[PDB]
Enzyme design. Structure first.
Site, mmCIF file in Angstrom:
data_model
loop_
_atom_site.group_PDB
_atom_site.id
_atom_site.type_symbol
_atom_site.label_atom_id
_atom_site.label_comp_id
_atom_site.label_asym_id
_atom_site.label_seq_id
_atom_site.Cartn_x
_atom_site.Cartn_y
_atom_site.Cartn_z
ATOM 1 N N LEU A 94 -0.046 -1.764 -11.454
ATOM 2 C CA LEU A 94 0.625 -2.979 -11.010
ATOM 3 C C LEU A 94 1.717 -2.650 -10.013
ATOM 4 C CD1 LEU A 94 0.933 -6.134 -11.432
ATOM 5 C CD2 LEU A 94 2.880 -5.480 -12.930
ATOM 6 N N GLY A 95 1.605 -3.216 -8.814
ATOM 7 C CA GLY A 95 2.666 -3.114 -7.830
ATOM 8 C C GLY A 95 3.809 -4.079 -8.121
ATOM 9 N N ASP B 36 3.832 0.634 -10.737
ATOM 10 C CA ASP B 36 4.489 1.233 -9.586
ATOM 11 C C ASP B 36 5.815 0.551 -9.259
ATOM 12 O OD1 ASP B 36 4.172 3.131 -7.163
ATOM 13 O OD2 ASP B 36 4.751 1.193 -6.300
ATOM 14 N N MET C 272 -3.777 9.855 -14.823
ATOM 15 C CA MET C 272 -3.121 8.727 -14.177
ATOM 16 C C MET C 272 -4.094 7.553 -14.059
ATOM 17 S SD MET C 272 -1.330 8.752 -10.450
ATOM 18 C CE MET C 272 -0.403 7.370 -9.817
ATOM 19 N N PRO C 273 -3.726 6.380 -14.592
ATOM 20 C CA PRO C 273 -4.634 5.227 -14.499
ATOM 21 C C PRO C 273 -4.878 4.853 -13.047
ATOM 22 C CG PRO C 273 -2.948 4.824 -16.159
ATOM 23 C CD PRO C 273 -2.539 6.071 -15.411
ATOM 24 N N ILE C 274 -6.141 4.633 -12.716
ATOM 25 C CA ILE C 274 -6.496 4.382 -11.321
ATOM 26 C C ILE C 274 -6.125 2.989 -10.824
ATOM 27 C CG2 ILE C 274 -8.294 6.126 -11.341
ATOM 28 C CD1 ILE C 274 -10.375 3.849 -11.412
ATOM 29 N N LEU C 275 -5.843 2.068 -11.744
ATOM 30 C CA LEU C 275 -5.443 0.711 -11.389
ATOM 31 C C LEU C 275 -4.040 0.470 -11.931
ATOM 32 C CD1 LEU C 275 -5.851 -1.983 -10.153
ATOM 33 C CD2 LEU C 275 -7.393 -2.616 -12.034
ATOM 34 N N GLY D 139 -2.046 18.320 -15.451
ATOM 35 C CA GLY D 139 -2.886 18.097 -16.613
ATOM 36 C C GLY D 139 -2.825 16.689 -17.191
ATOM 37 N N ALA D 140 -1.945 15.840 -16.655
ATOM 38 C CA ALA D 140 -1.845 14.460 -17.121
ATOM 39 C C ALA D 140 -2.880 13.578 -16.438
ATOM 40 C CB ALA D 140 -0.452 13.909 -16.883
ATOM 41 N N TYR E 240 13.276 -1.598 -4.669
ATOM 42 C CA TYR E 240 12.712 -2.922 -4.981
ATOM 43 C C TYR E 240 13.719 -3.789 -5.724
ATOM 44 C CZ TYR E 240 8.266 -0.578 -3.871
ATOM 45 O OH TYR E 240 7.255 0.169 -3.278
ATOM 46 N N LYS F 118 10.342 5.934 -7.210
ATOM 47 C CA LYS F 118 10.457 6.577 -5.915
ATOM 48 C C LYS F 118 11.907 6.723 -5.544
ATOM 49 C CE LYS F 118 6.359 3.872 -4.508
ATOM 50 N NZ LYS F 118 6.734 2.584 -5.167
ATOM 51 N N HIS G 180 9.977 8.486 -1.369
ATOM 52 C CA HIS G 180 9.456 7.184 -0.944
ATOM 53 C C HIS G 180 8.968 7.217 0.507
ATOM 54 C CE1 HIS G 180 9.967 2.633 -1.941
ATOM 55 N NE2 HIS G 180 8.940 2.807 -1.113
HETATM 56 N N1 LIG Z 1 5.260 3.613 -1.058
HETATM 57 C C1 LIG Z 1 5.436 2.609 -0.182
HETATM 58 O O1 LIG Z 1 6.058 2.794 0.883
HETATM 59 C C2 LIG Z 1 4.859 1.253 -0.509
HETATM 60 C C3 LIG Z 1 4.727 0.306 0.493
HETATM 61 C C4 LIG Z 1 4.179 -0.932 0.194
HETATM 62 C C5 LIG Z 1 3.757 -1.207 -1.093
HETATM 63 N N2 LIG Z 1 3.916 -0.270 -2.064
HETATM 64 C C6 LIG Z 1 3.493 -0.525 -3.456
HETATM 65 O O2 LIG Z 1 2.179 -1.112 -3.430
HETATM 66 C C7 LIG Z 1 2.230 -2.387 -4.073
HETATM 67 C C8 LIG Z 1 1.194 -3.349 -3.517
HETATM 68 O O3 LIG Z 1 1.399 -3.560 -2.112
HETATM 69 P P1 LIG Z 1 2.084 -4.910 -1.560
HETATM 70 O O4 LIG Z 1 3.049 -5.414 -2.575
HETATM 71 O O5 LIG Z 1 2.594 -4.522 -0.197
HETATM 72 O O6 LIG Z 1 0.901 -5.985 -1.278
HETATM 73 P P2 LIG Z 1 -0.574 -6.245 -1.877
HETATM 74 O O7 LIG Z 1 -0.696 -5.768 -3.282
HETATM 75 O O8 LIG Z 1 -1.551 -5.807 -0.838
HETATM 76 O O9 LIG Z 1 -0.485 -7.858 -1.840
HETATM 77 C C9 LIG Z 1 0.369 -8.589 -2.722
HETATM 78 C C10 LIG Z 1 0.280 -10.051 -2.300
HETATM 79 O O10 LIG Z 1 -1.034 -10.516 -2.624
HETATM 80 C C11 LIG Z 1 -0.941 -11.656 -3.486
HETATM 81 N N3 LIG Z 1 -2.041 -11.602 -4.472
HETATM 82 C C12 LIG Z 1 -2.135 -10.729 -5.484
HETATM 83 N N4 LIG Z 1 -3.281 -10.949 -6.169
HETATM 84 C C13 LIG Z 1 -3.931 -11.956 -5.544
HETATM 85 C C14 LIG Z 1 -5.128 -12.622 -5.783
HETATM 86 N N5 LIG Z 1 -5.947 -12.288 -6.809
HETATM 87 N N6 LIG Z 1 -5.477 -13.625 -4.949
HETATM 88 C C15 LIG Z 1 -4.691 -13.975 -3.926
HETATM 89 N N7 LIG Z 1 -3.531 -13.374 -3.675
HETATM 90 C C16 LIG Z 1 -3.137 -12.358 -4.477
HETATM 91 C C17 LIG Z 1 0.428 -11.569 -4.130
HETATM 92 O O11 LIG Z 1 0.872 -12.871 -4.493
HETATM 93 P P3 LIG Z 1 1.701 -13.171 -5.824
HETATM 94 O O12 LIG Z 1 2.446 -11.915 -6.202
HETATM 95 O O13 LIG Z 1 2.553 -14.343 -5.380
HETATM 96 O O14 LIG Z 1 0.686 -13.554 -6.871
HETATM 97 C C18 LIG Z 1 1.260 -10.958 -3.026
HETATM 98 O O15 LIG Z 1 1.689 -11.959 -2.091
HETATM 99 C C19 LIG Z 1 3.671 -2.815 -3.850
HETATM 100 O O16 LIG Z 1 4.060 -3.922 -4.669
HETATM 101 C C20 LIG Z 1 4.402 -1.525 -4.146
HETATM 102 O O17 LIG Z 1 4.386 -1.331 -5.570
HETATM 103 C C21 LIG Z 1 4.438 0.936 -1.794
HETATM 104 N N1 LIG Z 2 11.308 5.603 7.723
HETATM 105 C C1 LIG Z 2 10.863 4.589 7.371
HETATM 106 C C2 LIG Z 2 10.368 3.463 6.982
HETATM 107 C C3 LIG Z 2 10.925 2.860 5.862
HETATM 108 C C4 LIG Z 2 10.434 1.641 5.417
HETATM 109 C C5 LIG Z 2 9.395 1.010 6.083
HETATM 110 C C6 LIG Z 2 8.839 -0.323 5.623
HETATM 111 N N2 LIG Z 2 9.362 -0.765 4.338
HETATM 112 C C7 LIG Z 2 10.395 -1.573 4.239
HETATM 113 O O1 LIG Z 2 10.989 -1.952 5.245
HETATM 114 C C8 LIG Z 2 10.885 -2.018 2.901
HETATM 115 C C9 LIG Z 2 12.216 -2.392 2.811
HETATM 116 C C10 LIG Z 2 12.716 -2.825 1.598
HETATM 117 C C11 LIG Z 2 11.874 -2.890 0.498
HETATM 118 CL CL1 LIG Z 2 12.530 -3.462 -1.033
HETATM 119 C C12 LIG Z 2 10.546 -2.537 0.573
HETATM 120 C C13 LIG Z 2 10.047 -2.101 1.788
HETATM 121 O O2 LIG Z 2 8.749 -1.749 1.925
HETATM 122 C C14 LIG Z 2 7.999 -1.480 0.760
HETATM 123 C C15 LIG Z 2 8.259 -0.011 0.519
HETATM 124 O O3 LIG Z 2 8.858 0.691 1.375
HETATM 125 O O4 LIG Z 2 7.846 0.439 -0.535
HETATM 126 C C16 LIG Z 2 8.850 1.612 7.210
HETATM 127 C C17 LIG Z 2 9.339 2.834 7.668
HETATM 128 N N3 LIG Z 2 8.736 3.405 8.805
HETATM 129 O O5 LIG Z 2 9.068 4.517 9.201
HETATM 130 O O6 LIG Z 2 7.826 2.812 9.364
#
Ligand SMILES: NC(=O)c1ccc[n+]([C@@H]2O[C@H](COP(=O)([O-])OP(=O)(O)OC[C@H]3O[C@@H](n4cnc5c(N)ncnc54)[C@H](OP(=O)(O)O)[C@@H]3O)[C@@H](O)[C@H]2O)c1
Ligand SMILES: N#Cc1ccc(CNC(=O)c2ccc(Cl)cc2OCC(=O)O)cc1[N+](=O)[O-]
Length: 316
Positions: free
Chosen positions: A18-19, A44, A13-16, A10-11, A49, A78, A111
């Site tokens: 900050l990573g 996020d 979640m903002p669609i945009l 029921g909550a 991290y 996560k 995660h």
């Molecule tokens: N659940 C998971 O396993 C997982 C995996 C990956 C990511 N994530 C989450 O998703 C988030 C976003 O993904 P991501 O960090 O992999 O990469 P991303 O958001 O696709 O890309 C970030 C990169 O783009 C640059 N950037 C941002 N805005 C820009 C703009 N307007 N113009 C040009 N460059 C720009 C940033 O530079 P600067 O920061 O230097 O400005 C940074 O180098 C993560 O931070 C994390 O919170 C989760």
């Molecule tokens: N299993 C697995 C698995 C685990 C990790 C990854 C890739 N992620 C990383 O190596 C990672 C390590 C440190 C940090 Cl701070 C961030 C990272 O990625 C961003 C994120 O995970 O959110 C891939 C896999 N896998 O199975 O492919």
């Protein structure tokens, strides 16, 4: 379009959001402060991290300044792979809460579906480069996640990097207490995820697209890898709208009814990235962007491909 999407608790979640992966502790506090000022409410985070303290500093400062109240924020973290044991889950969640200086999370995700050997190291590897797994399984870890909701530590739970079969495992669990609210997965024009998105959305699971800009800062990038932000075909779509490529890449998932979490520590970019509610990508744009799919994953590790729960052997 509406700025929030309804979750199964029921909550809204903002669609945009900050990573914060790769936002260094020394720079992330200002990033989050700016983000909040310009309208971001969803942040996020993740224990792995290693900057949750500093994110927490920013949130605390903006709460005290009366810029936002807690209820308006949507804070996600996560559970890392080394804490999948049922006995480790609550402590991991509580460390995240302590670091963020919060008393609850809006959403807590598993995660990765893989458990890694418990210990200080986040990525334990064996002498030949394979990750050292733990003897944990998806269902037991989910059960531990459910306890967090029942204890009021987290309002909603979900998963990240789960393939459809792994999602199905949770959905088919006898005695399931909470369905996953969200599956957070990599998604962008080079990995459009049509089948997993269709699957999740059909099951009432909200999808968050991570790495929407192609994660150009990822530490295992190769110089010959395809670069989204630099793609001339996407720059052309942006120029057509008098927008930046990043703005196009953020708007793209929004129009697919996804949540999206672009990362920046750069104040100008943080502000720019949020200005995506004042234009629309055309049918043609959407079609063109989807057609760039190449099933190319920027977030995947060779060292994990032998883990029993490695998610990317399956087609989706
Ligand atoms: N659940 C998971 O396993 C997982 C995996 C990956 C990511 N994530 C989450 O998703 C988030 C976003 O993904 P991501 O960090 O992999 O990469 P991303 O958001 O696709 O890309 C970030 C990169 O783009 C640059 N950037 C941002 N805005 C820009 C703009 N307007 N113009 C040009 N460059 C720009 C940033 O530079 P600067 O920061 O230097 O400005 C940074 O180098 C993560 O931070 C994390 O919170 C989760
Ligand atoms: N299993 C697995 C698995 C685990 C990790 C990854 C890739 N992620 C990383 O190596 C990672 C390590 C440190 C940090 Cl701070 C961030 C990272 O990625 C961003 C994120 O995970 O959110 C891939 C896999 N896998 O199975 O492919």
């Amino acid at each position: 379009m509406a700025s929030r999407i309804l979750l199964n608790n029921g909550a809204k979640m903002p669609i945009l959001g900050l990573g914060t992966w790769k936002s260094p502790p020394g720079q992330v506090t200002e990033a989050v402060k700016v983000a909040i000022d310009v309208g971001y409410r969803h942040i996020d985070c993740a224990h792995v991290y290693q900057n949750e303290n500093e994110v927490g500093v920013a949130i605390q400062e903006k709460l005290r300044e009366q810029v936002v109240k807690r209820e308006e924020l949507f804070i996600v973290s996560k559970l890392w792979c080394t804490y999948h044991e049922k006995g480790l889950v609550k402590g991991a969640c509580q460390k995240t809460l302590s670091d963020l200086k919060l008393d609850y999370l809006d959403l807590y995700l598993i995660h990765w579906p893989t458990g890694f050997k418990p210990g200080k190291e986040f990525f334990p590897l064996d002498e030949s480069g394979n990750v050292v797994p733990s003897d944990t399984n998806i269902l037991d870890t989910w059960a531990a996640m459910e306890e967090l909701v029942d204890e009021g530590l987290v309002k909603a739970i979900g998963i990240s990097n789960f393939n459809h079969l792994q999602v199905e495992m949770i959905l088919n669990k006898p005695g399931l207490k909470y369905k996953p609210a969200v599956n957070q997965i990599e998604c962008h024009p080079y990995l459009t995820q049509e089948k997993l998105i269709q699957y999740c959305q059909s099951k009432g699971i909200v999808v968050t697209a991570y790495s929407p800009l192609g994660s150009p800062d990822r530490p295992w990038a190769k110089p010959e890898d395809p670069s989204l932000l630099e793609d001339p075909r996407i720059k052309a779509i942006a120029a057509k709208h008098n927008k930046t490529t990043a703005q196009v890449l953020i708007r793209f998932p929004m129009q697919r009814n996804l949540v999206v979490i672009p990362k920046s520590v750069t104040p100008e970019r943080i502000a720019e990235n949020f200005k995506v509610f004042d234009f629309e990508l055309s049918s043609q744009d959407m079609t063109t962007l989807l057609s760039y799919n190449r099933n190319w994953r920027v977030c995947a590790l060779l060292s994990c491909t032998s883990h029993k729960d490695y998610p990317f052997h399956e087609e989706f």
